[PDB]
């Protein structure tokens, strides 16, 4: 249900992700034209910036499935098991093509037996892509420093899109979500909180709200005021 409309900002990202969108909607068109798409896009940027959200939106913008997983979980699994699932991930994916496959914390694999077996499996799976393969693999990373070099070779994640901290609207949206469940006072202006927290990321905001919630309860107050919010921040 997420489209590029539900994504605040990310001008270039969406621009660069159009070719992908178009392709997923009518892959047969691109097949007939003899055109080849990258099919391996890595979103690079800090945590709580909207990478999973943008990816999901890319699958929605093309009204196609969005199959996810986490390079982190794969590594958490017993050796052999992780690679077994990487296998299951792409198998299921081909079953439901076109669509998007989203591997999160891909540096879990890129950056130990488990980690190696999962990496090789992923690589073989991605190298097994034929032209007629209508799957676009999107991965996410915030630690590009540790990402394994092989993942970035042409044919794999040979395309990257940097993603920065959310804009004023994107900040307001996160605050609004996380504000859900909290007794805000009348003076609370979430739009304003959004305006005066430039640079903040998902965590900075999710936390600020919580800390603002503690000063409230810790002082016995039954409602978080704009003050608490402003204080919680510093
Ligand atoms: N532009 C935006 N519009 C709406 N929500 C956003 C936006 N940017 C971030 N968010 C919120 O912040 C959370 C951050 O997680 P995610 O989008 O997966 O990115 P990341 O991989 O950087 O953590 C999302 O679940 C979403 O609810």
Curated annotation (Swiss-Prot):
Superkingdom of this protein's organism: Bacteria
Binding site for ATP: 8, 48-53
Localization per record: Cell inner membrane
Function in brief: Acts as a processive, ATP-dependent zinc metallopeptidase for both cytoplasmic and membrane proteins. Plays a role in the quality control of integral membrane proteins. Degrades preferentially unfolded substrates in a processive, ATP-dependent manner, usually after hydrophobic residues.
Name recorded for this polypeptide: ATP-dependent zinc metalloprotease FtsH
Organism listed in the record: Thermus thermophilus (strain ATCC 27634 / DSM 579 / HB8)
Domain notes: The open AAA+ domain (residues 126-400) probably allows nucleotide exchange and has the protease active site, while the closed domain is the active ATPase domain but the protease is inactive.
Shown stretch of the complete protein: 152 to 393 of 624
UniProt subunit comment: The isolated soluble domain (residues 126-624) forms a stable hexamer in which the AAA+ domains (residues 126-400) are alternatively open or closed.
Family: In the central section; belongs to the AAA ATPase family. In the C-terminal section; belongs to the peptidase M41 family.
